[PDB]
Amino acid sequence: SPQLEELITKVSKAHQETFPSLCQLGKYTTNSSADHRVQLDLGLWDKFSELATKCIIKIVEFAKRLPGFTGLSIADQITLLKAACLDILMLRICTRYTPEQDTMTFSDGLTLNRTQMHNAGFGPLTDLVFAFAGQLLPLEMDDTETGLLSAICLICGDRMDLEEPEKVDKLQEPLLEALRLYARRRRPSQPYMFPRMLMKITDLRGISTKGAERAITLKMEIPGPMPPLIREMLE
Numbered sequence: 001s002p003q004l005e006e007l008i009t010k011v012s013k014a015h016q017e018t019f020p021s022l023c024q025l026g027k028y029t030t031n032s033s034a035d036h037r038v039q040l041d042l043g044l045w046d047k048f049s050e051l052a053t054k055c056i057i058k059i060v061e062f063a064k065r066l067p068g069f070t071g072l073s074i075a076d077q078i079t080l081l082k083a084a085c086l087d088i089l090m091l092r093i094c095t096r097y098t099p100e101q102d103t104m105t106f107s108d109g110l111t112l113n114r115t116q117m118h119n120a121g122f123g124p125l126t127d128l129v130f131a132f133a134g135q136l137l138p139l140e141m142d143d144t145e146t147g148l149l150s151a152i153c154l155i156c157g158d159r160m161d162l163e164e165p166e167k168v169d170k171l172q173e174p175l176l177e178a179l180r181l182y183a184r185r186r187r188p189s190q191p192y193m194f195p196r197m198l199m200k201i202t203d204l205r206g207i208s209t210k211g212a213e214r215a216i217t218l219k220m221e222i223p224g225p226m227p228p229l230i231r232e233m234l235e
């Protein structure tokens, strides 16, 4: 129990230090392609993809702060990151949804409306991702819960090509314990919150599968290759 409390603190801090809260960011906007959907606005794609690269680096930094992660083989660290990074990216941007303005906010404060999210690359996946974001809201997750859920998504022993999947399973166990303890303590009158959170992982995987499908069509629409850390994620 003391060790589980320290794990909660450590994961919470790692998330906050690699992912600013919506409340913390100085929002700004752009007038690019703001009023009508187009196939792709290349200036918005260039900015979006740069922000995605930076957030991948942050997710790697977060991962290496999770207790035990750097005790895994470097190969298994890389396999886990490749398998989960798009899931965690999708979760992160959906936690930055402002329903009253129908916007999402990136880590530099860039705040895009739904049409701009579409035009920056989401394309035909846009409205389904905004609906996922919308349905995250009733859970009223806090940053500790988002951090723990992200860790659970990453540290999962079912990933293909792991060398030591039983070791990965054993690292996930206290994360699961920690999220249930935390979630029930915070909202004892809503005991379905922990299972609802875990079922969001399945939803995220479905959105990330659709995002990988979108990457294939977007590749045809952009003049050069995607950024190298994005290509790492997609392989």
Ligand SMILES: CCCCCCCCCCCCO[C@H]1O[C@H](CO)[C@@H](O[C@H]2O[C@H](CO)[C@@H](O)[C@H](O)[C@H]2O)[C@H](O)[C@H]1O
Pocket: 054, 056, 057, 058, 060, 061, 078, 081, 082, 085, 229, 232, 233
């Ligand atoms: C998901 C697919 C990826 C598979 C795993 C491979 C990802 C490899 C990531 C290792 C990154 C090495 O990191 C090394 O260079 C980064 C980029 O100059 C630095 O990154 C640094 O600058 C960034 C600015 O973009 C900051 O946001 C980081 O917080 C900061 O630490 C690191 O501090 C340094 O340790």
Ligand SMILES: CC1(C)CCC(C)(C)c2cc([C@@H](O)c3ccc4cc(C(=O)O)ccc4c3)ccc21
Pocket: 048, 049, 051, 052, 055, 086, 089, 090, 091, 092, 093, 105, 106, 107, 108, 120, 121, 122, 125, 210, 211, 212, 214, 215, 218, 226, 230, 234
């Ligand atoms: C694979 C690829 C390139 C193409 C296909 C689509 C458009 C589906 C896509 C969507 C994302 C998207 O989840 C995303 C992007 C930037 C993000 C930036 C931040 C941040 O600033 O803190 C946080 C979350 C983010 C989340 C990432 C890559 C991709």
